[PDB]
Scaffold this motif. Sequence first.
Motif, PDB file in Angstrom:
ATOM      1  N   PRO A 136     -41.310  -0.766 -33.261  1.00  0.00           N
ATOM      2  CA  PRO A 136     -41.417  -1.799 -32.236  1.00  0.00           C
ATOM      3  C   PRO A 136     -42.694  -1.674 -31.404  1.00  0.00           C
ATOM      4  N   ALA A 137     -43.400  -2.796 -31.235  1.00  0.00           N
ATOM      5  CA  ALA A 137     -44.665  -2.807 -30.519  1.00  0.00           C
ATOM      6  C   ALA A 137     -44.418  -2.650 -29.022  1.00  0.00           C
ATOM      7  N   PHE A 138     -45.492  -2.311 -28.300  1.00  0.00           N
ATOM      8  CA  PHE A 138     -45.471  -2.250 -26.847  1.00  0.00           C
ATOM      9  C   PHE A 138     -45.212  -3.646 -26.297  1.00  0.00           C
ATOM     10  N   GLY A 139     -44.221  -3.750 -25.401  1.00  0.00           N
ATOM     11  CA  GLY A 139     -43.875  -5.005 -24.753  1.00  0.00           C
ATOM     12  C   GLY A 139     -42.653  -5.662 -25.393  1.00  0.00           C
ATOM     13  N   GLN A 503     -23.072 -14.834 -18.276  1.00  0.00           N
ATOM     14  CA  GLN A 503     -23.008 -13.988 -19.458  1.00  0.00           C
ATOM     15  C   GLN A 503     -24.295 -13.176 -19.599  1.00  0.00           C
ATOM     16  N   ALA A 504     -25.443 -13.843 -19.434  1.00  0.00           N
ATOM     17  CA  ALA A 504     -26.741 -13.188 -19.481  1.00  0.00           C
ATOM     18  C   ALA A 504     -26.845 -12.117 -18.394  1.00  0.00           C
ATOM     19  N   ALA A 505     -26.247 -12.389 -17.228  1.00  0.00           N
ATOM     20  CA  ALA A 505     -26.252 -11.457 -16.112  1.00  0.00           C
ATOM     21  C   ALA A 505     -25.556 -10.152 -16.495  1.00  0.00           C
ATOM     22  N   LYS A 506     -24.486 -10.250 -17.290  1.00  0.00           N
ATOM     23  CA  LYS A 506     -23.736  -9.080 -17.720  1.00  0.00           C
ATOM     24  C   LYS A 506     -24.500  -8.271 -18.770  1.00  0.00           C
ATOM     25  N   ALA A 507     -25.604  -8.818 -19.302  1.00  0.00           N
ATOM     26  CA  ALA A 507     -26.388  -8.141 -20.326  1.00  0.00           C
ATOM     27  C   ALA A 507     -27.789  -7.815 -19.812  1.00  0.00           C
ATOM     28  N   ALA A 508     -27.958  -7.833 -18.483  1.00  0.00           N
ATOM     29  CA  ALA A 508     -29.266  -7.670 -17.870  1.00  0.00           C
ATOM     30  C   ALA A 508     -29.751  -6.227 -18.000  1.00  0.00           C
ATOM     31  N   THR A 509     -28.819  -5.270 -17.944  1.00  0.00           N
ATOM     32  CA  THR A 509     -29.157  -3.857 -18.020  1.00  0.00           C
ATOM     33  C   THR A 509     -29.021  -3.357 -19.459  1.00  0.00           C
ATOM     34  N   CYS A 510     -28.302  -4.114 -20.304  1.00  0.00           N
ATOM     35  CA  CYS A 510     -28.061  -3.735 -21.690  1.00  0.00           C
ATOM     36  C   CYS A 510     -27.938  -4.993 -22.545  1.00  0.00           C
ATOM     37  N   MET A 511     -28.987  -5.276 -23.325  1.00  0.00           N
ATOM     38  CA  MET A 511     -29.109  -6.537 -24.037  1.00  0.00           C
ATOM     39  C   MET A 511     -27.919  -6.736 -24.974  1.00  0.00           C
ATOM     40  N   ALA A 512     -27.454  -5.648 -25.599  1.00  0.00           N
ATOM     41  CA  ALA A 512     -26.405  -5.706 -26.609  1.00  0.00           C
ATOM     42  C   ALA A 512     -25.107  -6.301 -26.064  1.00  0.00           C
ATOM     43  N   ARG A 543     -33.606 -13.016 -12.099  1.00  0.00           N
ATOM     44  CA  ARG A 543     -34.677 -12.035 -12.007  1.00  0.00           C
ATOM     45  C   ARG A 543     -34.149 -10.608 -12.171  1.00  0.00           C
ATOM     46  N   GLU A 544     -32.882 -10.453 -12.575  1.00  0.00           N
ATOM     47  CA  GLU A 544     -32.267  -9.140 -12.691  1.00  0.00           C
ATOM     48  C   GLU A 544     -32.391  -8.594 -14.115  1.00  0.00           C
ATOM     49  N   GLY A 545     -33.122  -9.292 -14.993  1.00  0.00           N
ATOM     50  CA  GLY A 545     -33.142  -8.936 -16.403  1.00  0.00           C
ATOM     51  C   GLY A 545     -34.294  -7.999 -16.760  1.00  0.00           C
ATOM     52  N   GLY A 546     -34.892  -7.352 -15.753  1.00  0.00           N
ATOM     53  CA  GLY A 546     -36.153  -6.654 -15.946  1.00  0.00           C
ATOM     54  C   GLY A 546     -37.120  -7.533 -16.737  1.00  0.00           C
ATOM     55  N   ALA A 547     -37.554  -7.031 -17.899  1.00  0.00           N
ATOM     56  CA  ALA A 547     -38.492  -7.743 -18.752  1.00  0.00           C
ATOM     57  C   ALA A 547     -37.777  -8.462 -19.900  1.00  0.00           C
ATOM     58  N   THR A 548     -36.436  -8.477 -19.890  1.00  0.00           N
ATOM     59  CA  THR A 548     -35.666  -8.844 -21.072  1.00  0.00           C
ATOM     60  C   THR A 548     -35.145 -10.282 -20.999  1.00  0.00           C
ATOM     61  N   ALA A 549     -35.534 -11.041 -19.967  1.00  0.00           N
ATOM     62  CA  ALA A 549     -34.999 -12.377 -19.741  1.00  0.00           C
ATOM     63  C   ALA A 549     -35.393 -13.332 -20.872  1.00  0.00           C
ATOM     64  N   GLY A 565     -41.439 -20.884 -14.424  1.00  0.00           N
ATOM     65  CA  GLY A 565     -41.681 -19.629 -13.731  1.00  0.00           C
ATOM     66  C   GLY A 565     -40.761 -18.499 -14.192  1.00  0.00           C
ATOM     67  N   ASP A 566     -39.764 -18.800 -15.036  1.00  0.00           N
ATOM     68  CA  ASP A 566     -38.982 -17.754 -15.677  1.00  0.00           C
ATOM     69  C   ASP A 566     -39.918 -16.822 -16.445  1.00  0.00           C
ATOM     70  N   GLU A 567     -40.940 -17.406 -17.086  1.00  0.00           N
ATOM     71  CA  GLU A 567     -41.872 -16.659 -17.919  1.00  0.00           C
ATOM     72  C   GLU A 567     -42.734 -15.707 -17.084  1.00  0.00           C
ATOM     73  N   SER A 568     -42.895 -16.005 -15.785  1.00  0.00           N
ATOM     74  CA  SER A 568     -43.797 -15.265 -14.913  1.00  0.00           C
ATOM     75  C   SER A 568     -43.058 -14.659 -13.718  1.00  0.00           C
ATOM     76  N   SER A 569     -41.723 -14.576 -13.808  1.00  0.00           N
ATOM     77  CA  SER A 569     -40.872 -14.050 -12.746  1.00  0.00           C
ATOM     78  C   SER A 569     -41.234 -14.653 -11.386  1.00  0.00           C
ATOM     79  N   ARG A 570     -41.410 -15.984 -11.353  1.00  0.00           N
ATOM     80  CA  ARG A 570     -41.680 -16.720 -10.126  1.00  0.00           C
ATOM     81  C   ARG A 570     -40.658 -16.347  -9.051  1.00  0.00           C
ATOM     82  N   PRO A 571     -41.076 -15.778  -7.894  1.00  0.00           N
ATOM     83  CA  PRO A 571     -40.128 -15.339  -6.874  1.00  0.00           C
ATOM     84  C   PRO A 571     -39.418 -16.473  -6.136  1.00  0.00           C
ATOM     85  N   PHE A 572     -38.155 -16.216  -5.786  1.00  0.00           N
ATOM     86  CA  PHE A 572     -37.436 -17.043  -4.835  1.00  0.00           C
ATOM     87  C   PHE A 572     -38.299 -17.188  -3.585  1.00  0.00           C
TER      88      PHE A 572
END
Length: 650
Positions: A136-139, A503-512, A543-549, A565-572
């Motif tokens: 797996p590549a960096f990023g 559902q995505a929120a429940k997988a924010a710390t663990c994608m699986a 914004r809780e998905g780290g880099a995995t959103a 802004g999802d792509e750029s973590s546009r802040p609230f």
Amino acid sequence: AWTTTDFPAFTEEGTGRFISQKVVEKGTRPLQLNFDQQCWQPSGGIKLNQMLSMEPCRGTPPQWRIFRQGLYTLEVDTRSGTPTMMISLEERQCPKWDGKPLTIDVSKTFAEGSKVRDFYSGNVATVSGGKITLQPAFGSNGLLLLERAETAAPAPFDWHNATVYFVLTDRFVNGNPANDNSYGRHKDGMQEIGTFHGGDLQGLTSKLDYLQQMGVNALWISSPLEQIHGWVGGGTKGDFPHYAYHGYYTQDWSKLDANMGTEADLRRLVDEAHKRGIRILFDVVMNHAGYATLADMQEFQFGSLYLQGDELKKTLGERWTDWKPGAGQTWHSFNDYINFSDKAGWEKWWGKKWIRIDIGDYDNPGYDDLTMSLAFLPDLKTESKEISGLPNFYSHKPDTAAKAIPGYTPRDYLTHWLSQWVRDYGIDGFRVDTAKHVEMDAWQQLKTQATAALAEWKKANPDKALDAAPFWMTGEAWGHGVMQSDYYRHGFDAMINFDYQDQAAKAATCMANIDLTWQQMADKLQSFNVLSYLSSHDTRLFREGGATAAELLLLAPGAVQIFYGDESSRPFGPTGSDPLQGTRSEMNWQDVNGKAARSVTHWQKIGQFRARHPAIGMGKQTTLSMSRGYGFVRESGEDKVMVIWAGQQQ
Ligand SMILES: [Ca+2]
Ligand SMILES: [Ca+2]
Ligand SMILES: [Tb+3]
């Protein structure tokens, strides 16, 4: 060929950008980047999440201070000619990953002796003994995006594999500042929570390449149609002026809002979008018109004030909309000047045949979804059979394209007005607001008329049309889930899915953790479609998905919606006393070229992957059984992908 000590060789993550990652213990160390015999170093100190200038190596190298242990990313950017760089930190029953290559059993998926590409890295491998080995590549966040190496370009567009970008035009790009203050609109000089920031169609048109690179093939814009000119009290406390910057407070459906631009600006938006294989969706409203404002009351000579005589000009001014709250008042206080009980005054507005509202001599709102006044908004009488003529106040609005048509009801006008845009500009679909507050029949009429309008345009414009696909329509029925409701049999091709967010929120710390949701959705959506989102203008920013959103959304079955802004973590942003306002914060373009650049790259790659593989959006899922990591296969027609997630790197 970019390197620094005690970090792996940098790989290219976007054109002209190179990155490297490693888990680093706390401590202090020097920092130099080498590119062969070129040596560079930070020249302006070392901070996280900031573009660091760099000079050629001299004297003692700058000492980089590692405060907290974690996975760090070093990035170097050569696009400016001189190297800048950047540092950043990514702060269980969850698969763990040692960081080293994976060996994947692909025997049931990819043919012995064939070539398989991990799209993210670009690395290609030959299947031998039913197996490939890949780093797996960096990023990647430990992802492998496995396809046949034969895969070369985007697959044909399907609405069931659509990547929809939902943008509030006013908050995206300001192409032309001249039109920021149409109809006497002002900035508040505070935090601009509810004002027109000045984003326009021209600006949006300038970013079509950027959207195309993300693998976006549908562009959902806020309504460009003419809104109420003025403002209302913002939030529960009236701490800001609320203007119709979002497009949901329409006044004239027949005209563009001057803030957005000209007819030509729209034509260019749609035509350029089509050239790039991107479909266009208007956000549309038929439930309600915008609130009564001072700007509109004065301009179009309707409503009734308690202020009479000299008292009127001395309190509200020459232009009433220029009123600002004094001491002891809020932006709601202006309401006390308005007489909402006066029958004759308020009949001069839309008129008794058009709306329901607890004002004057109007039909009172009902006590159900369909006839209620949603947040005190004038409820259009879509179910009415009465021939209405034009709205009363249009008599004082000579710039309208709206003509009285023999026999037309309020609904007939609305569907005509929206369809005309489809007919004239070739709008590919609609996103329908407040779907559960208008009767199903009205939506069916809209769909029928819009379908005809699009077909007419495509026939008139054979050079421009991309295909002969029919008009598309999605809707917002509040709280709708992954279900084929009756909306699907009254003109909706898909409904927006409110359940994916949690559902995505429940997988924010663990994608699986998303696996069960993805399996259910892939199966259920073999017979229909939905539009799923992480973030929206009436929920929250995810914004809780780290880099995995990116992967959490874009690898979802069914159509998916990127909120700008999802792509750029546009802040609230600033939100005052309305909890939703912060979700409409300004697009963070400065971050896009700086600290969010690798995030944007990540989204581009995963989006480009989805665009190449209908199996993502449409295919049946088989979740793989492995000893290490998490993996699944999806399959639709001849298309087949395997997605492997190595697991958590810490
Ligand atoms: Ca502008
Ligand atoms: Ca209604
Ligand atoms: Tb209902």
